[PDB]
Amino acid sequence: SFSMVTRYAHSPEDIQHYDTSKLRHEFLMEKIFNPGDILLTYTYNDRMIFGGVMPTDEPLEIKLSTELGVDFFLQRRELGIINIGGAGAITIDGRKDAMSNQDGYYIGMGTQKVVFTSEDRDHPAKFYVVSTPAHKTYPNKKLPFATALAKPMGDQQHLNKRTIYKYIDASQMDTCQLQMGYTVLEPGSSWNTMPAHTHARRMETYMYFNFADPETRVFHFLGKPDETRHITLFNEQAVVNPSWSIHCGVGTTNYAFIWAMCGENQTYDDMDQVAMNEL
Numbered sequence: 386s387f388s389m390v391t392r393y394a395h396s397p398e399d400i401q402h403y404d405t406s407k408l409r410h411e412f413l414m415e416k417i418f419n420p421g422d423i424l425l426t427y428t429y430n431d432r433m434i435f436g437g438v439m440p441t442d443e444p445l446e447i448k449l450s451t452e453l454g455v456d457f458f459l460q461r462r463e464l465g466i467i468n469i470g471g472a473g474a475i476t477i478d479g480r481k482d483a484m485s486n487q488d489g490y491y492i493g494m495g496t497q498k499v500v501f502t503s504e505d506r507d508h509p510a511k512f513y514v515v516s517t518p519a520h521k522t523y524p525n526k527k528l529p530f531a532t533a534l535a536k537p538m539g540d541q542q543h544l545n546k547r548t549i550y551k552y553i554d555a556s557q558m559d560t561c562q563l564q565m566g567y568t569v570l571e572p573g574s575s576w577n578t579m580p581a582h583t584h585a586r587r588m589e590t591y592m593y594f595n596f597a598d599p600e601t602r603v604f605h606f607l608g609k610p611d612e613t614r615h616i617t618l619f620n621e622q623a624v625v626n627p628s629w630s631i632h633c634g635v636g637t638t639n640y641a642f643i644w645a646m647c648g649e650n651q652t653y654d655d656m657d658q659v660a661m662n663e664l
């Protein structure tokens with residue numbers, strides 16, 4: 386009950402006649418949180434590894450050495466974490482730090498052992514993890530939801546009314562590549578990232594969760610700004626957006642998602658806002 390599947394990169398021109406079911410196979414991770422299991426995917430867009438760890442009875446660790454050609458998982462890599470589930474803790478090189486809901490952690494390169502645990506076996510913590518390669522070691526930082534920064538954004542005229550939470554951000558901390566965040570749209574608002582953009586120099590991954598209703602749906606937009614497609618998401622699913630693709634979404638109700646951005650730069654404003662011509 387450990388899984389890591391591989392996904393490739395593509396030309397924009399490669400996906401152009403792609404059907405939905407194969408669009409979903411290349412870009413969408415359908416199952417992320419299954420009790421007791423580790424579910425991760427390895428994308429060749431800047432080699433991001435993301436997925437989820439849901440420990441229940443016995444604690445879990447992402448144990449990967451030979452597969453990545455190293456002796457331990459984070460020998461050459463950094464790792465972000467946000468817990469969207471129940472109460473838990475992670476022990477990091479022995480230091481056990483409790484993790485309550487929407488608490489996050491940045492763990493830099495060189496950390497040998499990271500064990501995730503849950504406190505209650507039937508109300509587990511859901512650890513959404515993102516690991517990205519790192520050439521320099523930076524300090525570990527716990528990112529409490531209490532300390533988590535809340536920025537008002539949106540109007541109801543644009544149906545984007547929401548609150549963004551910065552977790553791993555270059556202005557508040559030092560990492561190599563990884564940037565992480567969390568967005569809750571308020572009820573009555575469905576649009577995320579709507580005035581849209583592409584960033585040639587880095588990529589992003591959206592993971593949608595906490596759907597308002599069991600029947601809620603998210604339509605995540607994808608593709609090159611002139612040629613766009615969409616994928617339809619159930620709760621707790623994720624979509625890799627390559628550097629040449631835009632990324633936005635709409636729900637039938639409100640929801641939340643975590644964004645994880647990485648690439649060769651951390652500059653936030655190296656990006657092209659797509660004017661509204663999208664065919």
Ligand SMILES: [Zn+2]
Pocket residue numbers: 582584589646
């Ligand atoms: Zn972006």
